[PDB]
Amino acid sequence: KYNENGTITDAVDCALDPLSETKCTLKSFTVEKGIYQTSNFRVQPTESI
Amino acid sequence: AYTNSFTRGVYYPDKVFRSSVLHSTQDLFLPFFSNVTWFHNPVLPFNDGVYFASTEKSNIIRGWIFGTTLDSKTQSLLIVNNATNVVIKVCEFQFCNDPFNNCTFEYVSNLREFVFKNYFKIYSKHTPILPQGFSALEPLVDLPIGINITRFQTLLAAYYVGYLQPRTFLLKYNENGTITDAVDCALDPLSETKCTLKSFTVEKGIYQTSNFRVQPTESIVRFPNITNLCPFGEVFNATRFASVYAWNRKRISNCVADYSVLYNSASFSTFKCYGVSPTKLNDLCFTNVYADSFVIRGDEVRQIAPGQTGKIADYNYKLPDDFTGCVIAWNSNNLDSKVGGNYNYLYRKPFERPLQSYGFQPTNGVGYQPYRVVVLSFATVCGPKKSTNLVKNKCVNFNFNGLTGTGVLTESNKKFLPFQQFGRDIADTTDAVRDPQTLEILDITPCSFGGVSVITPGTNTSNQVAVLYQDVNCTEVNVFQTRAGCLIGAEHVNNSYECDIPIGAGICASYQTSQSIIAYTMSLGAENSVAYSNNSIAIPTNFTISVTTEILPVSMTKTSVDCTMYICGDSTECSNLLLQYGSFCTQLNRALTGIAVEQDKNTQEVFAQVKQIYKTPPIKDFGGFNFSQILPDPSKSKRSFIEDLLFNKVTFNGLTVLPPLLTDEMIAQYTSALLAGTITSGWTFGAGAALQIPFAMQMAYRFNGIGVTQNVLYENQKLIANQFNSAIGKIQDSLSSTASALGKLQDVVNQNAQALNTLVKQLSSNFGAISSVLNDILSRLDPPEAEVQIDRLITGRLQSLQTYVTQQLIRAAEIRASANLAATKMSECVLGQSKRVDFCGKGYHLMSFPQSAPHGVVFLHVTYVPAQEKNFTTAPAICHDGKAHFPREGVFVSNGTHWFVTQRNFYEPQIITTDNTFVSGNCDVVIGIVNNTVYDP
Amino acid sequence: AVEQDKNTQEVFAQVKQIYKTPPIKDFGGFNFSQILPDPSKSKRSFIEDLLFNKVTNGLTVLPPLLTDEMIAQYTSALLAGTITSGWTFGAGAALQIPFAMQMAYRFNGIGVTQNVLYENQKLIANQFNSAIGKIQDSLSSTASALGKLQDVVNQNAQALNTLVKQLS
Amino acid sequence: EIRASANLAATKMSECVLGQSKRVDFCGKGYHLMSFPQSAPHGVVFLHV
Amino acid sequence: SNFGAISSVLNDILSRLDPPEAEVQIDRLITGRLQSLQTYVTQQLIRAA
Numbered sequence A: 001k002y003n004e005n006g007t008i009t010d011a012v013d014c015a016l017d018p019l020s021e022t023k024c025t026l027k028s029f030t031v032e033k034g035i036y037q038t039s040n041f042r043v044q045p046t047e048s049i
Numbered sequence B: 001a002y003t004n005s006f007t008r009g010v011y012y013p014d015k016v017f018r019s020s021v022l023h024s025t026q027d028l029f030l031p032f033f034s035n036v037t038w039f040h041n042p043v044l045p046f047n048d049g050v051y052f053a054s055t056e057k058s059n060i061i062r063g064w065i066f067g068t069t070l071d072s073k074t075q076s077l078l079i080v081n082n083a084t085n086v087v088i089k090v091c092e093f094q095f096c097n098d099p100f101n102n103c104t105f106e107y108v109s110n111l112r113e114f115v116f117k118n119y120f121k122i123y124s125k126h127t128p129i130l131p132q133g134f135s136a137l138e139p140l141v142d143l144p145i146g147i148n149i150t151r152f153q154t155l156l157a158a159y160y161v162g163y164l165q166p167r168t169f170l171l172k173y174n175e176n177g178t179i180t181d182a183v184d185c186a187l188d189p190l191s192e193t194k195c196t197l198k199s200f201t202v203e204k205g206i207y208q209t210s211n212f213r214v215q216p217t218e219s220i221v222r223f224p225n226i227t228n229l230c231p232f233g234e235v236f237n238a239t240r241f242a243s244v245y246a247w248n249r250k251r252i253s254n255c256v257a258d259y260s261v262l263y264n265s266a267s268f269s270t271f272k273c274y275g276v277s278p279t280k281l282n283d284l285c286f287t288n289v290y291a292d293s294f295v296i297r298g299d300e301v302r303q304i305a306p307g308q309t310g311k312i313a314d315y316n317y318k319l320p321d322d323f324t325g326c327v328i329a330w331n332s333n334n335l336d337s338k339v340g341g342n343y344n345y346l347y348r349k350p351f352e353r354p355l356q357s358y359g360f361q362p363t364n365g366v367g368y369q370p371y372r373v374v375v376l377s378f379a380t381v382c383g384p385k386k387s388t389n390l391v392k393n394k395c396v397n398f399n400f401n402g403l404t405g406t407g408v409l410t411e412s413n414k415k416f417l418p419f420q421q422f423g424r425d426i427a428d429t430t431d432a433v434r435d436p437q438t439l440e441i442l443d444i445t446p447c448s449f450g451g452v453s454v455i456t457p458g459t460n461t462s463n464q465v466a467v468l469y470q471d472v473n474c475t476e477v478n479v480f481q482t483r484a485g486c487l488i489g490a491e492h493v494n495n496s497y498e499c500d501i502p503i504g505a506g507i508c509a510s511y512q513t514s515q516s517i518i519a520y521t522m523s524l525g526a527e528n529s530v531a532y533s534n535n536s537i538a539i540p541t542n543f544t545i546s547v548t549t550e551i552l553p554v555s556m557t558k559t560s561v562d563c564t565m566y567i568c569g570d571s572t573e574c575s576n577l578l579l580q581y582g583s584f585c586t587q588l589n590r591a592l593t594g595i596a597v598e599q600d601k602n603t604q605e606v607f608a609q610v611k612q613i614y615k616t617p618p619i620k621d622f623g624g625f626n627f628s629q630i631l632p633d634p635s636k637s638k639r640s641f642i643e644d645l646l647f648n649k650v651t652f653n654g655l656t657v658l659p660p661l662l663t664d665e666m667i668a669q670y671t672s673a674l675l676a677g678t679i680t681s682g683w684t685f686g687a688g689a690a691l692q693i694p695f696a697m698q699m700a701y702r703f704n705g706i707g708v709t710q711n712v713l714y715e716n717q718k719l720i721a722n723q724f725n726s727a728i729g730k731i732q733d734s735l736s737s738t739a740s741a742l743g744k745l746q747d748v749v750n751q752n753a754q755a756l757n758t759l760v761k762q763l764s765s766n767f768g769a770i771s772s773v774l775n776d777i778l779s780r781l782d783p784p785e786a787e788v789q790i791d792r793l794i795t796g797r798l799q800s801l802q803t804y805v806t807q808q809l810i811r812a813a814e815i816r817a818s819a820n821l822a823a824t825k826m827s828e829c830v831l832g833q834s835k836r837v838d839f840c841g842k843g844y845h846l847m848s849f850p851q852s853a854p855h856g857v858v859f860l861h862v863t864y865v866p867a868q869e870k871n872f873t874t875a876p877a878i879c880h881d882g883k884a885h886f887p888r889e890g891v892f893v894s895n896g897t898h899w900f901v902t903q904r905n906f907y908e909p910q911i912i913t914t915d916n917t918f919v920s921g922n923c924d925v926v927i928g929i930v931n932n933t934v935y936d937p
Numbered sequence C: 001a002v003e004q005d006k007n008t009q010e011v012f013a014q015v016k017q018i019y020k021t022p023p024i025k026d027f028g029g030f031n032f033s034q035i036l037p038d039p040s041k042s043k044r045s046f047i048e049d050l051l052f053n054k055v056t057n058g059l060t061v062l063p064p065l066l067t068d069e070m071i072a073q074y075t076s077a078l079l080a081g082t083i084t085s086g087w088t089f090g091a092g093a094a095l096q097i098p099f100a101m102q103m104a105y106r107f108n109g110i111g112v113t114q115n116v117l118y119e120n121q122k123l124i125a126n127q128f129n130s131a132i133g134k135i136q137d138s139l140s141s142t143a144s145a146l147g148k149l150q151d152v153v154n155q156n157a158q159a160l161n162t163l164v165k166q167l168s
Numbered sequence D: 001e002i003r004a005s006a007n008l009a010a011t012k013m014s015e016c017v018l019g020q021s022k023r024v025d026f027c028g029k030g031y032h033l034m035s036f037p038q039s040a041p042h043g044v045v046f047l048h049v
Numbered sequence E: 001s002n003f004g005a006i007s008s009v010l011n012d013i014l015s016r017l018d019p020p021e022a023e024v025q026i027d028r029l030i031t032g033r034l035q036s037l038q039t040y041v042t043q044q045l046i047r048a049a
């Protein structure tokens, strides 16, 4: 978040928690009441065959 | 002797397992119902490949020979089954005239079927018992020989030989991956329909499966007939030639230069071109051509070339090393040579013009003879492009100067100006041309074409079809010519009927009685008339209560597509490239999310008209009206008998489906509440509080609302309740009997399924890429090259999603409009009594009941419809004491002796009294007024 | 293309039977001869002819299922019903009614007692007849009167012309 | 849009021609009595009385 | 967005490259931006309906 003088005054770490994910998805520091789709859960491979 | 191959000649096209799927493929298969030669030894054609089959008891046939000669010289393929094994060899075998080294390959291992096709592969099947039936042959032997086979011989019992063709088949794979059936897409128009629809079953209707296009039969090439030629005869047939030191240079320009004379002529000792091919000189064009003409000694003619040295090449006549042109020369021993010696020819940068003479004499050797040499050094000098004759009134491939195309040439009426060679239609389209040889103008009519539609009854009834060729005549293609096109196979019938399968322009087709496809002008309904007069009125004396069913869609499947997983499924390299498109991926996700939300809004707006959940009592006394088939069944999902009938008649790539907020039970609770409200409190629950009312009384209001006095209901209450109960039973029979009753909901499901199926199928497309599979690109190419192939897939897949989303949004607009209408109908039709004609079905609307349904809502509309009527004499008014009496309600009628007053929607004559009529104006004013007596109580 | 035939049928095919008018035109003084089909000619009314006369690569065009004559038959049937059986052919049977009585209903339907119609029937019929003549003058004089239909045609023509020109 | 227009036209024929509309300004200005349909190129024209 | 181009800025492409290559980089931006307008217009027409 850049203010009027171009100084970064805030930030969202998009991997910190599910609310941060919502804030990054909506490109906002405020999230309104509701349900939002932000990602896609995926099981990762553990072996190489 | 020949036999019918029926459906034999199918084999597994590859080594990939498939199951429970209809797969379309094109390969060399035996065409269905083809002609196979029946043998019971000769060398036969192989063509593209061979279908071979035999029926044996004693196993006489042992093998085959394949090749081009079957007689040494080259390799032949010998496949022989002998004793306990099979021996395959491809040696340069010397065969007997009547059979029955340098080897590159050798290998050693009742109805029998084989496929021998090209390297060479063998497919086969062996079954106990040419018999009719179907099975698929499987690959057993792969022979990577690279051997040319044009002919083959069978080594010896009956056998059949057919030939394979590159035609498309729809192959049906069962649960175990066995091909159990097939459609030959080239067999007939029904097979084409089955292949087009990717199904072995075809529904009744008209389908466009192909396109008819008239092909050109010959080509026409036209150029001006050589108005200007260059004088090559003044160079090669010149009376006198110059020396090599100081030669003649003639300029060749502004002409058609025909070099076939110089090339083909046998008078030349040599003809060689350096920069260009000597046989392309008439196709080529040069800016300028110059002829350098001189006489030199035979042995020195070899110096007239690029890259040469010597007396001529260095001091007299030098050519460039990058010289473009042709050197032509011939002996002049009988022309220039003289007995005492011709010494008039003298010799010493490229083309740059002390000296000695040549002693040219007729008696010297060949190397000492004079040769006349002409060098043509190479826009204004172009070759004689050849023309052909022009053919009119046929489809041709034409070429007029620089303009080409396909069409039919006919005489025009277009007055081209003296300098105009070509013409155009409004959309920059060639309409006519001027012939370059003859000053005539010809119109170009595009060769006839149009869609090809197959008209068919369902395949559950008949496999007979008719074919309609759209917007064409019956010359280019039991034939009926109509405005819509040329219909072949349907009979023309004079009698009109209700439309079944539409053709267009007033024409429909059907399958009727023995039965055949017919075409006819459609009927718009029965012809009738109203028995109108100034003094006659028809008034209903009886009525029925009917129930109709109106089926409306409310919602779409709430699909959702993950744009990243769809395009770049578990691929980091693809995702990095996908991000170069900014928000395009995000926009697609947002658009689909918005629709999924809208679909819950549609359902809520349509069903949640009531904020409370109402239920009927254990008391079902509604005055004889039986609602048990529309009310929820308490022993079960809590749905009615009709609701169950409605539901029972409708059916890993980032594509998922989200559930609706309101489930089938929740909707059932809303339709239950609305129904309980409708039955026990009428419309009052809609306006506000649910106010209980006896059902018979509620109906009294419903009847007054349509102009039928309440006493009619009570006097005929038993009749009305019985008609209602019967009508509901009829609804159940209709819904149970045919699933087509709910086509409107099934159509929504089908369109959404097709949209999703299309989106998945597009994943297999290459879009110009080396592979449709992202993982196969990544495993083959390094990033500098892989990224290009991936971008091709991203553009195609991203474009596919954009197409899908646009279609879903437009379709959603239709569904939303339907949902808005359904919501409007429920409020005005169920939670009230609509007066809008044909809004709640035909008749005078009384009441309606909602029912739940998959992806939509179904309404049962209960309406009042006149059943029986009589012809009454009428008048607008009656005369009493000279004053004009008008009815307060209803009309005046006469039975032939007495006048009565009665309500318009039900005949119920009353005595005309001062309490039934009012007075306004008089008998000298009202037109059509008649004499009567009005009773005064 | 299929949808466009559905639109046509939903709008015009609203009557189960094709009804014709009688040889008598005694409709209480109301003159409908300019909206009824001309029996001497394409079986269309005088006004319908005015309406029609004011509207003007791999690409083909399919005909409609219902041709101008089929539409004319439906408008004729609907009109015959409207004039001789009022609103009842809509609900069910095409019950005959004298035109003056049909209008009496129509007047009561707007809160005006039917005696007004009969007392002023000559005036009302004359005003109606005049108004229809005015419709004909308006349609004949002002081509733009049907601008909505011309605009749909123009938009479709432009869409096709754009598609073809893009080939260049 | 054409479909929506056709649906409106169909509604009008059913309520305005076959019946007697009580919907204000649905069948033109004034108190609606009756209407008559006329055919037209690519559409329908109504005369509202 | 780059849309496959070396730069999202048209003036940067023109200042850095001569036409033989600049036209390629520009064509990539034209396809992407033309596609973006087509997407926008389609959404405006549907929303407008």
Ligand SMILES: *[C@@H]1O[C@H](CO)[C@@H](O[C@@H]2O[C@H](CO)[C@@H](O)[C@H](O)[C@H]2NC(C)=O)[C@H](O)[C@H]1NC(C)=O
Pocket: B620, B626, B628, B629
């Ligand atoms: C309402 O109609 C249902 C039928 O739709 C009646 O139920 C049937 O009653 C008969 C006689 O007892 C049984 O033989 C049938 O098997 C019943 N059918 C079903 C589906 O249950 C019901 O009795 C009627 N109720 C009233 C009050 O008339």
Ligand SMILES: *[C@@H]1O[C@H](CO)[C@@H](O[C@@H]2O[C@H](CO)[C@@H](O)[C@H](O)[C@H]2NC(C)=O)[C@H](O)[C@H]1NC(C)=O
Pocket: B895, B896, B897, B898
């Ligand atoms: C018209 O209706 C009147 C009234 O019902 C009929 O006159 C009656 O006819 C019955 C015999 O069916 C007599 O018993 C009554 O006394 C008659 N009433 C009067 C007032 O005369 C009359 O017959 C009917 N006319 C026709 C042609 O049906």
Ligand SMILES: *[C@@H]1O[C@H](CO)[C@@H](O[C@@H]2O[C@H](CO)[C@@H](O)[C@H](O)[C@H]2NC(C)=O)[C@H](O)[C@H]1NC(C)=O
Pocket: B879, B923, B929, B930, B931
């Ligand atoms: C109703 O009956 C009366 C007779 O009682 C009719 O009045 C007569 O009409 C004729 C013809 O114009 C005159 O010659 C008589 O002198 C009139 N008689 C009286 C007493 O006025 C009247 O016209 C009839 N009306 C209808 C509608 O039939």
Ligand SMILES: *[C@@H]1O[C@H](CO)[C@@H](O[C@@H]2O[C@H](CO)[C@@H](O)[C@H](O)[C@H]2NC(C)=O)[C@H](O)[C@H]1NC(C)=O
Pocket: C025, C031, C032, C033
């Ligand atoms: C309806 O009005 C038309 C005029 O618009 C009448 O037709 C005219 O009839 C007269 C004879 O009385 C002829 O001289 C005219 O030439 C006709 N004109 C046209 C345009 O046809 C028609 O007769 C009237 N019909 C009714 C039932 O009143």
Ligand SMILES: *[C@@H]1O[C@H](CO)[C@@H](O)[C@H](O)[C@H]1NC(C)=O
Pocket: A003, A004, A005
């Ligand atoms: C910008 O700087 C000025 C001082 O020059 C300060 O008064 C103002 O509040 C600053 N604005 C922001 C958003 O930090």
Ligand SMILES: *[C@@H]1O[C@H](CO)[C@@H](O)[C@H](O)[C@H]1NC(C)=O
Pocket: B002, B003, B004, B005, B033, B034, B035
């Ligand atoms: C095979 O050809 C003969 C003509 O020689 C023809 O009569 C017969 O019907 C054909 N059979 C099939 C199956 O095509």
Ligand SMILES: *[C@@H]1O[C@H](CO)[C@@H](O)[C@H](O)[C@H]1NC(C)=O
Pocket: B082, B083, B084, B085, B087
């Ligand atoms: C089949 O014929 C070949 C001829 O080369 C012979 O070598 C082979 O042994 C024969 N097979 C058997 C089972 O005898």
Ligand SMILES: *[C@@H]1O[C@H](CO)[C@@H](O)[C@H](O)[C@H]1NC(C)=O
Pocket: B072, B073, B092, B101, B102
């Ligand atoms: C086999 O190849 C040799 C050359 O190595 C050739 O001379 C001989 O004729 C060939 N065999 C036959 C049957 O032609």
Ligand SMILES: *[C@@H]1O[C@H](CO)[C@@H](O)[C@H](O)[C@H]1NC(C)=O
Pocket: B068, B148, B149, B150
């Ligand atoms: C196979 O032999 C034929 C001559 O019978 C010849 O025309 C054809 O080109 C040959 N094909 C190949 C692939 O050698």
Ligand SMILES: *[C@@H]1O[C@H](CO)[C@@H](O)[C@H](O)[C@H]1NC(C)=O
Pocket: B174, B175, B176
């Ligand atoms: C698959 O094989 C099993 C075992 O032979 C058989 O019972 C089953 O019917 C087969 N399925 C099909 C579709 O033929």
Ligand SMILES: *[C@@H]1O[C@H](CO)[C@@H](O)[C@H](O)[C@H]1NC(C)=O
Pocket: B224, B225, B226, B227, B436, B437, B438
């Ligand atoms: C072609 O020859 C015809 C005579 O057969 C002549 O009339 C015509 O003008 C010639 N055309 C050209 C272009 O020379």
Ligand SMILES: *[C@@H]1O[C@H](CO)[C@@H](O)[C@H](O)[C@H]1NC(C)=O
Pocket: B232, B233, B236, B237, B261, B262
């Ligand atoms: C030279 O004359 C002969 C005989 O007439 C002729 O056949 C040949 O084509 C002529 N050569 C050229 C270049 O015209």
Ligand SMILES: *[C@@H]1O[C@H](CO)[C@@H](O)[C@H](O)[C@H]1NC(C)=O
Pocket: B460
């Ligand atoms: C349609 O054909 C199937 C057999 O594939 C049969 O079971 C079904 O009853 C038939 N339906 C009708 C309506 O004849």
Ligand SMILES: *[C@@H]1O[C@H](CO)[C@@H](O)[C@H](O)[C@H]1NC(C)=O
Pocket: B473, B474, B475, B481
């Ligand atoms: C083309 O169709 C018309 C009917 O519209 C017919 O009269 C004409 O003869 C047909 N043309 C040919 C060459 O048969």
Ligand SMILES: *[C@@H]1O[C@H](CO)[C@@H](O)[C@H](O)[C@H]1NC(C)=O
Pocket: B492, B493, B494
């Ligand atoms: C219709 O009937 C006429 C005789 O009135 C006859 O000439 C014509 O061929 C018949 N057409 C059909 C399709 O039956």
Ligand SMILES: *[C@@H]1O[C@H](CO)[C@@H](O)[C@H](O)[C@H]1NC(C)=O
Pocket: B541, B542, B543, B716, B719
């Ligand atoms: C109407 O017709 C039915 C026969 O379907 C009869 O039972 C009923 O009594 C009749 N009602 C009247 C009012 O005529």
